[PDB]
Amino acid sequence: GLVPRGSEDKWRNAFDHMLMEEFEEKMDQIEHGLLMLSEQYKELEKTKSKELKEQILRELTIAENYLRGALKFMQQEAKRTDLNMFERYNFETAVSTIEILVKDLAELAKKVKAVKS
Amino acid sequence: GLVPRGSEDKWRNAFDHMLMEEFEEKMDQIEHGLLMLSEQYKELEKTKSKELKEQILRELTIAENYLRGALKFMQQEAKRTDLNMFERYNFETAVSTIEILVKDLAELAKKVKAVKS
């Protein structure tokens, strides 16, 4: 049942496949949540709701914390000495995708904090 | 739309709900992977397959790295200064659930390493 170690084009390890599939799903969910928070931000510019402002900031903090933990996992697996082409590509891509999303979150946080409430 | 901050019986934060709503189910899937590896270990005791031994160890190394990180994360969430009754219970329970899996993984790793291959 074992994937040959010489395979270059697929996940050789079952836990890599499982965990990376769940990570990818979470990144899609976070990107969508950020889009929803951006739209709440648009409402906040008009209403100046203190509760909405504080809540968006809480959400952004939660997402950031999660992504920082994910990033540590990805960077650590990316330092593996035994990495095939497919695995290296998937881990390096994940690192890139997270680092971008962390930036997008921090940018929304800045806009939200700028709302005089 | 926002959950009142005084609510005690649910996730107040959407990103907490997103991250945690299927948590215990996801951990069940890790537990199941550990079961499959335990059963492979029983085959290994008979065959003494070097490849099977190494592959079980690789899988447990990946799961260990994931869980050590998830544990540290959940322990920090349980230190939040604003936690309601439900949020605290769920974070604390998650810490316990992860601790159990970490212990089971370390025990299996020890038995697998001992197979003289």
Author numbering:
A (entry chain A), B (entry chain B): 1 to 117
What did the paper state?
Among these, group 21 allergens including Blo t 217, Der p 218 and Der f 219 identified in B. tropicalis, D. pteronyssinus and D. farinae, respectively, are known as mid-tier allergens in the allergic response. The structure of rDer f 21 adopts a bundle of three anti-parallel α-helices similar to the group 21 HDM allergen Blo t 2116, and group 5 HDM allergens including Blo t 514,15 and Der p 512. The crystal structure of rDer f 21 revealed an elongated dimer structure with molecules A and B interacting in a head-to-toe orientation. Helices α1 and α2 form an intermolecular anti-parallel dimeric interface while the C-terminal α-helix (α3) is fully exposed to the solvent.
The structure of rDer f 21 bound to a molecule of PEG 400, rDer f 21PEG400, was determined to 1.5 Å resolution from a crystal belonging to C-centered monoclinic space group C2. The structure contains two molecules per asymmetric unit forming a rDer f 21 dimer. Each molecule of rDer f 21PEG400 is approximately 60 × 17 × 14 Å and forms a coiled coil bundle structure composed of three anti-parallel α-helices denoted as α1 (A14 to T47), α2 (K50 to A78), and α3 (M85 to K113). Structural comparison of two molecules A and B representing the asymmetric unit of the rDer f 21PEG400 crystal structure shows a significant structural deviation localised at the α1 helix of molecule B between residues 20-30. The r.m.s.d. between the two molecules is reaching up to 4.3 Å. The dramatic conformational changes at the helix α1 of the molecule B are caused by the binding of a well-ordered PEG 400 molecule (from the crystallization buffer) in the pocket of the rDer f 21PEG400 molecule. Interestingly, the coordinates of other residues surrounding the ligand binding pocket including F23 and Y66 are well conserved. The conformational changes enable binding of the ligand into the dimer interface cavity, an event which may otherwise be prevented by steric clashes. The binding cavity consists mostly of hydrophobic residues including A70 and three aromatic residues F23, F73, and Y66. The PEG 400 molecule in the cavity of the rDer f 21 dimer interface only forms one hydrogen bond to Y66A (residue Y66 of molecule A) and is further coordinated via several hydrogen bonds with water molecules in the cavity. The lack of direct hydrogen bonds between the PEG 400 molecule and the surrounding residues suggests that the cavity would prioritize a hydrophobic ligand.
